[PDB]
Design a protein around this ligand. Structure first.
Ligand SMILES: Nc1nc2c(ncn2[C@@H]2O[C@H](COP(=O)(O)OP(=O)(O)OP(=O)(O)O)[C@@H](O)[C@H]2O)c(=O)[nH]1
Ligand SMILES: Nc1nc2c(ncn2[C@@H]2O[C@H](COP(=O)(O)OP(=O)(O)OP(=O)(O)O)[C@@H](O)[C@H]2O)c(=O)[nH]1
Ligand SMILES: Nc1nc2c(ncn2[C@@H]2O[C@H](COP(=O)(O)OP(=O)(O)OP(=O)(O)O)[C@@H](O)[C@H]2O)c(=O)[nH]1
Ligand SMILES: Nc1nc2c(ncn2[C@@H]2O[C@H](COP(=O)(O)OP(=O)(O)OP(=O)(O)O)[C@@H](O)[C@H]2O)c(=O)[nH]1
Ligand SMILES: [Mg+2]
Ligand SMILES: [Mg+2]
Ligand SMILES: [Mg+2]
Ligand SMILES: [Mg+2]
Lengths: 127, 428, 432, 432, 427
């Protein structure tokens, strides 16, 4: 039964009041701050994107280094094959000529001896 | 977040990509000539996510078709929906990649990479609001793996703010083409860890097993394998091409699915499992989420813990029943979800079922069990690398042995990371 | 004149605005083309008038993506709004607070303030703003907090009242919603004067239980939300007597600046398809006010203490019957108030009857009531949210998405520490 | 595009080239005059003149004119331009030293000049296919010199061989093991892949499978041509699965020196019989692991496979191939090394194996050619090495080589290199 | 490797040389006037190896006929096929060599050597692709032995890159009683060891024995001995004259037959053994490879080991049967082939049989048993040299005793070398 009703307002489409059952037991930012925070965030977002592109540029450079390595290795293989073969063809030419020069030296000496035999036959004959 | 630019690279990438285009065209009511002849407004509401509207009522796939060899391009052009593609978007070399990642990434792939960028740039500049890129490729060959990963990093350079998504076909000795597959796959995983946002792991080991064990096909062919891949890709993209609230775009999907940057490798799931020549209730479909038999990656979901899962239900079914069954599947299987990622399973229901089915379910899982797939590749890799077998074909291309040790280390680190979070408890 | 500008942010804010403005038109006799074949002139606080005799909402609808606002631009009410007040960007905040606040929001913020300034220019006695937004979305969270900050700079002592959608798993769109909620609450705490929170789960369950709707859609939820918003704003749009101006909301419900989160309760919520039932008495609808099943936010007022209670009656209601209803409730229930506040209620009767959207899920009732009570029990909603935040943040799960947008990890620590201080404040205020 | 230049060296290389080019003409519908009344892959092996005639991308070389003169006056004398049929006056007299140095050096530049002119007409040269015997003075010595000069002029450009391994049944010289070891040593570093063909194996298959009492080179070369055509069908046609020069190398060669695949072919049916019926895909696949169908005599059960490439042709379906390979995977008798996770490269061409009309081979619906890297092929090197040692220990016939400018140290170097190769096959067959 | 230049020196060389030319002319269908009247294309395919094509359709033997005495040359001109030879190619002196090697090599022979070189140079320069030279001569006389060996060294000096081949008739006391034959033969062997690539040893001891023991000719004449030589020479040159794969040229034959430079002395074999007025089966023919009775050098093939063998079968026979029988003959007789020269027996089959026969077999053997022939010459030589008998015949011509000691040493070394490889094991 103890309920204090207090009228507040009454208008065209309304009415208001307070009902009290018991009394109580115990009686700014700035645009600059905002802009500083948003620009700091944009710089971090741009920095990580820029570092990504720097690393992707490092992978493009590696791609070029492997292609250059492949081309240098093919050219070095050609260089080694060329001088190995030139050495082999020239050693063989020296050897074949040396073998055939030695066999013609033998034949030449035998023909010098033949004229020496002819010389002795001539002095045995006549005299 | 509107347009997606699709790229398909190499034999595998072009084969699964052509199959993707033929399934989603049928679903959207688009014929082989690009003409729309459907009977629903939902079919055209988000048609622009994958198709460009050309001169007079026709729709053309926003697809770039890539290969270092022409044969694959010819077979696609001749195929069922071959004429739907933009002729200028077929980019191909003549040399081939010789099933060598080093040739695709550094030598012949590098010579053709600019021709591809020019075609994808033309497609991207035409976009009112580009979401990003979707690449289908194999990790076992030369072009899809080597050139596909080279393209990702060149596109990363020009479009660093766009989403990079891949459908990556993992090799298996069960359906193998080349002896060096573990090298090509490891060198590609290393690239995907660093440069993609979302990678769907399409394992040939799991697809072969589904065909052989479940579909009872004694001798499965790539057509049998690719029928599962086409149903799976139709299911994972449902959110992107039909009206809906959840994971409607590539970035929203990534934010919901990837808690840690390197852990972006998804294990796709699908029910019902069908063969090419021909039921299923809501509780039956929800159960297949923990069924290794329904997984497209050769991992057991009960072997790990799900970090995040997206479940897509299609066809005429009760949303109330789907909601009840999805709550029950998470509560009953609490031990297979990480406790420190609350409400990590998001469900979506679409009234349009995939081509040929009346009801379906597709699960995009980010599970720590995917480490089994990476461990399998790592063990096949070390078996060859220990003996330096076939290494002259990579070093002959200008590669150093160091890139192999680095690719292997990064992959073992990724396995170690999945294991770390599998064991991670809420009580630190 | 006491004009109020409504700002609808993101998908939730815009879709709730659709329900609100449709209902205000029904309540004031305004047709979808802005015409009204003309009670009182108080409706002018929410509607300006053009030279052609058409009534235009004092409202701005903002989204970082255009899909949702495009439905308003092409819908039944496309003539009610002028296109300059429906603002959209091209790319959304991808459910990321940092993306909506620091990256995308930053480029459209000036345009929104410019349009707000043009609406404020048409006001003779601008009371302040009513901002509708979700806690969970990247735009509802990030863009709203950025907008609150600039509104404090441009409109110093102007009142800012929020209607905020508290995340619920049943209709949740993102895993990171607890992060966005704590981050937006931290940045908005100092710039808001009063925020009426609405838990999607509470309204989802009221739709299922009271309206017999199997799988409630946003259409169903927003129709219900709209009834509650209409009940709250009724005394600004009609010549009412309680909460007749925006400043009165802070005076009657907010004793301390940080504890500005009233709990909303509404009754009766009756199904339209219900077999011709007998009308609920004043006593019956008042009793329902004190039932947790009728609350907008899930929490237990038995576990807390009231610091203010406002009863907003509507329709066929007599003060004699209200006083008798309140007398019985004190007799039977506890109604514990904090020791420094008197135990009591501020009662308001708005004679304008409860209006429902024809063809909707709600039945037209003869009398209804909306209670706004500042209770310490609402800290249970913050505790739920804070715990989910901690679970993910301990592992830095998904944090890379925010840091990648330019945010620092320190902001997560600052935001969570601020909501830990808020939890302690509710505890301190409820002590004796 | 993707061109291949064929180099035929000495009597064996030229006579095998006769069989191959006759068969390619039959397979592509090219008449002996170069005319052909659409795949177009044959352009890898045939260039086209302004007059629409198709000319082989081939050079035929011999140090004596007798053998090449048969091409110059034969049925296909209009198919080749006379500048691509190169001959000297004096042969190498079954001496490697004469082929490589004394006689070869006088014609080497001319041959390179003509190869350069064929290379000029190539837009995408894959590499070279060199056909030669191991035993002949020209086949051994001139090929070694040519291999070396091609590495200088074309660097690392793919160089693949078809080498005739000596057999006593048809052997022409006692010193053939010397010529084989010297050419293998010189060639090891310049070749990317060498397909060896043992004359005794071709001889015995002709006797057993084709019922030919005393097989002639005509009979051997017709069968060899069938095998060479199978290896090049993937290059000259576009079937279900193709394999280029690079794909052969990558799959079959794990280490640079280990570049000797074993060739197997099935079915080899006599043009007689008729009651042979048609062999299934499984039947022809199984036959490839039978030692009776091998091109080199060796026992694969005594070794381990590191790679297997299956080249199918005709009425072959991939489903049928996979089933056949699956049964082969389960064969205990077929052992692979532990460091090779997968050793199967499959290629399928729709064009059945065409036979020379009037020949010894029957027209089959489907056929297969397997290329396998087995450590068992080291048995062929061991046979050859032993015969070398027997003669070299006494310096028997060595004076013939030394007399031409060669040094004895070259014999020691060549034999030591083949001893290292034998150790390499042993090491590679070991488990890890 | 196309043309061969043939030289025949002295009485013996001209007699066996004329017989070679008449047998191969008949086989190739060439008449005494040089006209071809054959029927087979195989007859003319390699006709250029031995014949020049002259004005009109005539074929002229690429042969130089040499002698220090005119008689044998007159006999050849008068003989069957005498007119086939180029008249300018008959080079003869008047003096003779008096069965003295020193006169042929150093005195009379040296005076006529330039006239011969003039004619062989004209023949050799006319060649599109010269294989080398083929010389028929005796080792026991003066001209064939002395001048023939002088010609080899002079021709070698001008053509060091060509093959030097000889058909050398070894003396025997059975046929010829001219006492110094062991000296003339030893001085010639010494020259042949150093300057020829291949020497066919035609032993008069073996020829006499075949005629006497097998052909039952009580008193054999040079005509009877030379009928065996003509059949043997037709057989050994089969590979050079007809199309074929094996040993088709002089260098390819040498590379297949000679493992050591000095060991280039061949033991020719022939079956069937026929009289001047006379068919075996394939197994019968293959057996004669180890039959000392069928050898043209007086050595037993079973006494040594074959380093290399070329077996030539002629006539209408099965190549399959020849292959089966040849495998059986080396498997059954494994102990007579050196183990350290693998597959050292090469077989060839020609459809054209020799003149007068329907089937034949010819064996070119490089056997260590040939040391028996050299030992026989060495013992005969030492028997005379020990006493310095007839030395003034050689020293009177300007020779030193030292050339004799050197020729003897070289020959004993050659015997010692055959013995060394006969005993050499694979170990
Ligand atoms: N599921 C599936 N896997 C495929 C298909 N084609 C190839 N693969 C797999 O992909 C891997 C080979 O990669 P590919 O894409 O074919 O190679 P590539 O890029 O064409 O390389 P090149 O031939 O050098 O141009 C292997 O592990 C195959 O099992 C296909 O149509 N479907
Ligand atoms: N009651 C209600 N909640 C909604 C509505 N639309 C979205 N939500 C809730 O809002 C949260 C998602 O935030 P949204 O407002 O859709 O996102 P946004 O503000 O547009 O931000 P972005 O799309 O990320 O740029 C989830 O908790 C949803 O359940 C709606 O119409 N009514
Ligand atoms: N399969 C086969 N082997 C052959 C053929 N011709 C020769 N041979 C073999 O090749 C080896 C001999 O080498 P050849 O090629 O004839 O000699 P070449 O290369 O002409 O050298 P020279 O004549 O010495 O200058 C022996 O093993 C023969 O059996 C042929 O047509 N087919
Ligand atoms: N088989 C054979 N041996 C012959 C023939 N004529 C001579 N001989 C042998 O040759 C040796 C004698 O040598 P000749 O050729 O006659 O003498 P030369 O070479 O002409 O020398 P000179 O008579 O001095 O001018 C002896 O061993 C004879 O047995 C012949 O026609 N056939
Ligand atoms: Mg391909
Ligand atoms: Mg939105
Ligand atoms: Mg030759
Ligand atoms: Mg005389």
């Amino acid at each position: 039964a103890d309920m204090e009703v207090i009228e507040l307002n009454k208008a065209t489409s309304g009415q208001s009041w307070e009902v009290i059952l018991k009394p109580p037991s115990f009686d700014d930012p700035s645009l600059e701050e905002i802009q500083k925070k948003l620009e700091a965030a944009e710089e971090r977002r741009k920095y990580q994107e820029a570092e990504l592109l720097k690393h992707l540029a490092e992978k493009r450079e590696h791609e070029r280094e492997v292609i250059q390595k492949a081309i240098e290795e093919n050219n070095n293989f050609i260089k080694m094959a060329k001088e190995k073969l030139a050495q082999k063809m020239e050693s063989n030419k020296e050897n074949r000529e040396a073998h055939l020069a030695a066999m013609l030296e033998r034949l030449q000496e035998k023909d010098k001896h033949a004229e020496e035999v002819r010389k002795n036959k001539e002095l045995k004959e006549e005299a | 977040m509107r347009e997606i630019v699709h790229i398909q690279a190499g034999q595998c990438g072009n084969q699964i990509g052509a199959k993707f285009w033929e399934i989603i065209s049928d679903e959207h009511g688009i014929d082989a000539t690009g003409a729309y002849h459907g009977d629903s407004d939902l079919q055209l509401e988000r048609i622009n996510v994958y198709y460009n509207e050309a001169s007079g009522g026709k729709y053309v796939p926003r697809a770039v078709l890539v290969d270092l060899e022409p044969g694959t391009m010819d077979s696609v052009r001749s195929g069922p929906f071959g004429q739907i593609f933009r002729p200028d978007n077929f980019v191909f070399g003549q040399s081939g990649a010789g099933n060598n990642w080093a040739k695709g990434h550094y030598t012949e792939g590098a010579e053709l990479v600019d021709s591809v960028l020019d075609v994808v740039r033309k497609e991207a500049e035409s976009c009112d609001c580009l979401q990003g890129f979707q690449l289908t490729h194999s990790l076992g060959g030369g072009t899809g793996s080597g050139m596909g990963t080279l393209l990702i990093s060149k596109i990363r350079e020009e479009y660093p703010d766009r989403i990079m998504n891949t459908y990556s076909v993992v090799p298996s000795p069960k359906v193998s083409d080349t002896v060096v597959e573990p090298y090509n796959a490891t060198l590609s995983v290393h690239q995907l860890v660093e440069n993609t946002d979302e990678t769907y792991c399409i394992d040939n080991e799991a697809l072969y097993d589904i065909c052989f064990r479940t579909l009872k096909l004694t001798t499965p062919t790539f057509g049998d394998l690719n029928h599962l891949v086409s149903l799976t890709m139709s299911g994972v993209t449902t959110c992107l091409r039909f009206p809906g609230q959840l994971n409607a775009d590539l970035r929203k999907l990534a934010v919901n699915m990837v808690p840690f940057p390197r852990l972006h490798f998804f294990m796709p799931g699908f029910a019902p499992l069908t063969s090419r020549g021909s039921a299923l209730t809501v509780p039956e479909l929800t159960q297949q989420m923990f069924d290794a038999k329904n997984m497209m990656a050769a991992c057991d979901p009960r072997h790990g813990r799900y970090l995040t899962v997206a479940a897509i239900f299609r066809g005429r079914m009760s949303m109330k029943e789907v909601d009840e069954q999805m709550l029950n599947i998470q509560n009953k299987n609490s031990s297979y979800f990480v406790e420190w990622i609350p409400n990590n399973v998001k469900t979506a229901v679409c009234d349009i079922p995939p081509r040929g089915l009346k009801m379906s379910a597709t699960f995009i899982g980010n599970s720590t069990a995917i480490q089994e797939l990476f461990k399998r590749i790592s063990e096949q890799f070390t078996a060859m690398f220990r003996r330096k077998a076939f290494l002259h074909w990579y070093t002959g291309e200008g590669m150093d042995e160091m890139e192999f040790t680095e690719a292997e280390s990064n992959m073992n680190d990724l396995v170690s990371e999945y294991q770390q979070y599998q064991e991670a408890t809420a009580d630190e | 004149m006491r004009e109020c500008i409504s700002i609808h942010v993101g998908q939730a804010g815009v879709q709730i605005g659709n329900a609100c403005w449709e209902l205000y038109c029904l309540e004031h006799g305004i047709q979808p083309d802005g015409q009204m074949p003309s009670g009182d002139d108080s409706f002018n606080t929410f509607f300006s008038e053009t030279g052609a005799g058409k009534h235009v909402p004092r409202a701005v609808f903002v989204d970082l993506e255009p899909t949702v606002v495009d439905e308003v631009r092409t819908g039944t009410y496309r003539q009610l709004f002028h296109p300059e007040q429906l603002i959209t960007g091209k790319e959304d905040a991808a459910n990321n607070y940092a993306r909506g606040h620091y990256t995308i929001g930053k480029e459209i913020v000036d345009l929104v303030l410019d349009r707000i300034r043009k609406l404020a220019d048409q006001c003779t006695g601008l009371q302040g703003f009513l901002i509708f937004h979700s806690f969970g979305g990247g735009t509802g969270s990030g863009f709203t907090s950025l907008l609150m900050e600039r509104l404090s700079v441009d409109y110093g002592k102007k009142s800012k009242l929020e209607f905020a959608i508290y995340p619920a798993p049943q209709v949740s769109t993102a895993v990171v919603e607890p992060y966005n909620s704590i981050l937006t609450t931290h940045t908005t705490l100092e710039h808001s004067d009063c925020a009426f929170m609405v838990d999607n789960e509470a309204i989802y369950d009221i739709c299922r239980r009271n309206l017999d709707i199997e799988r409630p859609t946003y259409t169903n939820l927003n129709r219900l939300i709209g009834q509650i918003v209409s009940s709250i704003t009724a005394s600004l749009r009609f010549d009412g007597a309680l909460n007749v101006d925006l400043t009165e909301f802070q005076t009657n419900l907010v004793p301390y600046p940080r504890i500005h989160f009233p709990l909303v309760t509404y009754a009766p919520v009756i199904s339209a398809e219900k077999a011709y039932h007998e009308q609920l008495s004043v006593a019956e609808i008042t009793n329902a006010c004190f039932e947790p099943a009728n609350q907008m936010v899930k929490c237990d007022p038995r576990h807390g203490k009231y610091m203010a209670c406002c009863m907003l009656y509507r329709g066929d209601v007599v003060p004699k019957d209200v006083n008798a209803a309140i007398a019985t409730i004190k007799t039977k229930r506890t109604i514990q108030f904090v020791d420094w506040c008197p135990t009591g209620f501020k009662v308001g009767i708005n004679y304008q009857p409860p209006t429902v959207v024809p063809g909707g899920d709600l039945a037209k009732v003869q009398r209804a009531v909306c209670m706004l009570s500042n209770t310490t029990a609402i800290a249970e909603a913050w505790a739920r949210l804070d715990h989910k935040f901690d679970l993910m943040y301990a592992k830095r799960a998904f944090v890379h998405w925010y840091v990648g947008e330019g945010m620092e990890e320190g902001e997560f620590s600052e935001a969570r520490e601020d909501l830990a201080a808020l939890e302690k404040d509710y505890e301190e205020v409820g002590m004796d």
